[PDB]
Structure formats: structure tokens, C-alpha cells
Amino acid sequence: SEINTDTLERVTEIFKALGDYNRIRIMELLSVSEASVGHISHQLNLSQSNVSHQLKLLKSLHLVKAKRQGQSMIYSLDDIHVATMLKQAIHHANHPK
């Protein structure tokens, strides 16, 4: 329950932030496997500056989280709701209509 105006505004901000091709590419990468900024940048052919900027935004909205491992920051989808939202959307885009 607890669907009030504030909730739907935050939901709106989540979808607004995800309405970005490169952010979707970052999120899909993290949906397959957690990764560092250097690995995301290398895999997607995006600069480390840019990846870091987008991940600061995604983190502020609780869409990714980060932990320090050895020397680096490892990012992941924040929790199972974010993973489920994303994978359900990808499958829906993919399956025939």
C-alpha cells in the first residue's frame, strides 16, 4: 500500500533517470554482473568520467549501490526490485507482440 503523491513522484524520477540509453546499458551490464567503473567503462566504451557521473545519479535514486573491494568500487543493482523491474522490462521489449 502507501501509494501517495510523494511515492509516485519518486517513481517518476526513477523512470526519468532510466530514460537514457547509456544508463540502460550500464544497468543491464550490472544486471548480468556487478562491476567496477573501469570495467563498465571498458566494456561499454564509455569514459570513466561519464560512467562515474551516471552512477552517482543512479546511486542517489537507490538504483545502484557500491562496495569497496580490494582497491576499487564495485557497483551493483541496488536490490531485487530494481533487478526485477529492469529484466521484466527487457523481456517485455524482446518478446513478440
Added chain:
Amino acid sequence: SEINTDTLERVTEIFKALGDYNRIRIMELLSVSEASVGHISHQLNLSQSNVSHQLKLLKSLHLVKAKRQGQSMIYSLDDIHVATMLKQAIHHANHPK
């Protein structure tokens, strides 16, 4: 599987279209119960013109569908992936961090 560039572009368009407060309100209403344009308009205090415009957009992206019942067009979330995506996002926005 089948995560290619086209898929992620369509995913991007889905999240872009959902990055809209009133469209989120329409989608949440439909997530509770299917409804006609007149009922959506009345419940959300949005004009029928506007509701109809937003639903044409949401339908073109396979996010809602419509059936004719009696005299009116009844809209609903397109399938279970759309409902799941939306409700998971709402819950994630709601729960504590």
C-alpha cells in the same frame, strides 16, 4: 537472452515514456483496475483529451492495451511484465533505505 542494441533502445523508449508524472498516475490506476478513458479522467482529474493522448502513446509502446466493452474502450496494463515492472518500482520507491 537476445539483448541486442535494438532491445535496449526499445527499453529506453519505455522508460522515457514512463518518465512522466501523469502517465505514472494513469499506469498506477490501471495497475489497480482496468478502466475507461472517462473513468481515468474523472478519477485523476485530467481531461479526456489528455488521458486519450497519453494512452495512445502508452499503447504504441505496448504498455497498455484496450478492449471494447458495451459502449466504451477499457484500458489495462498490457501484460504481467508491465504490471510487475511498475509495482516493483512503486514498492522500491516506498520501502525504507
